[PDB]
Write a protein that binds this ligand. Structure first.
Ligand SMILES: Cc1ccc(Cn2cc(C(N)=O)ccc2=O)c(C)c1
Ligand SMILES: Cc1ccc(Cn2cc(C(N)=O)ccc2=O)c(C)c1
Ligand SMILES: Cc1c[n+]2nc(N)[nH]c2nc1OC(C)C
Ligand SMILES: Cc1c[n+]2nc(N)[nH]c2nc1OC(C)C
Lengths: 318, 318
């Protein structure tokens, strides 16, 4: 044991906890200045004693070197797409269909309802709690390695906040740029004669395809996690909402507008509530994602491969 | 001009026309013996005058050499999958959803209704009327080159029956083995101590993965065409049924049980009619494929990429 190893370990733990309070809980226990005081003390100490510098320390989010290009990543589990609806009657038809298709329809049928963010879909792998790899969705099968860019995102933890992290955990979600950051970036680009962005979605996509993480780091990007891919060495909750609460409890940012709704009429109330809230959120949303909350019912329902909306195979019973 | 070139040209035309009457129309104008008399006269003449032998002649369906292996074919247009239903209420929900999702719902909403064959999905390319390539569906993106095996199928024309074939035409359909052939094959395999097949679907799949076309040729395989892929140098009909009638009119086999039905209740009548007919068809069917007949309505509805049945994105209107 040495005093400087202990000071480093204490500063790192303290800083990860404050980043959690600030970014995930939206309830910081100390002022921004106090966080910075400790951050730059950690940074100086690590540079004065480099033998003790760690790759997942809060000070190591930004690579000092711009990349030459992006490698490809074939996802182990494919990143699927989402069906869509444009009316209450259409949503009601989707529910009526699940009601008939299920062996046993429960009373109530609970949905996990979320706002649909307007950003870039990503997959982030944590190995024994440490962020090791991140990829874009791409076509759902293969994407680009954006690990160095994802590491710059302030609300993305480099280490999971648990003493018993899973062996492997892949977090799925959306990277977006809130309104305030987007307006600041466009003002800056105008004041320093550069390319302005038409909308927050374009600003987030453009920021994530930067080969220099030093540029990505200056872009006000945020992650909201909405799912899990690989999950080894853990018993994941049996409802979708509980899995999201579990990600939030181990350091991963999740949207605070997510609710449970029993039946189609409550879900439509959520849709309407979120639709009126649109003007006050501070980031863009295209709609709402409504998911069957029970994982066993999701597994029973399964998925539909790339197919027409204009055809169906009415199969005969045995 | 020579008398033998003219005799060859006349025999070939006559034989293709009789194969059409026999296989597509199910209305042969001559006995089987008359067809064979002309077939073996053509075959002897071609062997006596090999300079005039053509690769698409009715006598050249079977390659004399077994293949070493199967090459891969990436489809130019992906081969999609089909959504499914297991009840009237579920089918009715699928229709209710199309009714709401369409800009303008026509009165009536016409469906092209077909039996769902229980075979192997294939893609067959004709270049200026000549069969040049055939592939299995595989995963919908890449499949295997089974040209030599597809050429052995008696009801598959090596040449389209039209003087103005399209520049390129890809026919999509199912290869299956009728009951009579399946029962004969299993009796033969038992009488010559060999592998028997559990069902016609397995017998068709196993027959198409034979590297020796001489073995495939002895398997009683049939094609029923249900769609079009590539279509260059032609104005395809604007309804699905008319496209199928057009394939039938240029030499391609299509199922005779296909009908047009106006609205969900007529479609369910078709489903019931086909369900009672099951015991009398002479080949296996899993259900019925019900498709929106108007191509512009299909195009408007589009497709759903690989997605869950347990989630939906209810999008906000502009
Ligand atoms: C100078 C400075 C330092 C920190 C922050 C924001 N912030 C605050 C905390 C905190 N309060 O625990 C933790 C992480 C973080 O990123 C800003 C905007 C500016
Ligand atoms: C010996 C023999 C010859 C032909 C056939 C069947 N058949 C008949 C015709 C025909 N009638 O125009 C055309 C093609 C064809 O395949 C069988 C079963 C047996
Ligand atoms: C593509 C996608 C996008 N989103 N967005 C949310 N909120 N959830 C969600 N889930 C998705 O996909 C899973 C349902 C497969
Ligand atoms: C896979 C498939 C299978 N089947 N079978 C029939 N009869 N039609 C049909 N259409 C298909 O696909 C298109 C609708 C894309």
């Amino acid at each position: 044991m040495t005093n400087i190893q202990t000071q480093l370990d204490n500063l790192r733990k303290t800083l990860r906890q404050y980043e959690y309070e600030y970014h995930v809980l939206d309830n910081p226990s100390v002022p921004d200045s106090e966080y910075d005081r400790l951050f730059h003390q950690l940074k100086a100490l690590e540079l004065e004693h480099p033998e003790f510098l760690t790759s997942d320390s809060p000070t190591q989010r930004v690579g000092a070197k711009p990349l030459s290009g992006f490698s490809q990543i074939r996802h182990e589990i494919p990143m699927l797409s989402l069906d869509n609806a444009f009316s209450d009657a259409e949503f009601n038809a989707f529910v009526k269909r699940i009601e008939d298709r299920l062996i046993l329809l429960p009373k109530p049928l609970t949905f996990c309802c979320e706002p649909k963010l307007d950003g870039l879909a990503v997959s982030i792998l944590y190995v024994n709690g440490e962020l090791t790899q991140a990829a874009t969705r791409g076509d759902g099968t293969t994407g680009e390695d954006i690990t160095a860019n994802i590491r710059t995102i302030r609300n993305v933890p480099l280490q999971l906040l648990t003493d018993n992290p899973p062996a492997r955990l892949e977090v799925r979600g959306e990277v977006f740029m809130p309104h305030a950051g987007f307006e600041r970036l466009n003002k800056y680009a105008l004041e320093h004669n550069e390319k302005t962005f038409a909308n927050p979605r374009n600003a987030a996509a453009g920021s994530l395809r930067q080969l220099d993480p030093n540029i990505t780091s200056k872009r006000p990007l945020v992650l909201n996690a909405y799912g899990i891919g690989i999950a080894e060495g853990v018993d994941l909750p049996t409802t979708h909402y509980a899995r999201l609460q579990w990600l939030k409890s181990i350091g991963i940012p999740v949207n605070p507008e997510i609710r449970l709704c029993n039946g189609a009429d409550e879900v439509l109330g959520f849709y309407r509530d979120i639709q009126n809230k649109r003007s006050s959120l501070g980031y863009d949303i295209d709609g709402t994602v409504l998911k069957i909350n029970d994982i066993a019912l999701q597994n029973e329902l399964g998925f539909i491969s790339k197919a027409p909306r204009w055809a169906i195979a009415y199969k005969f019973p045995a």
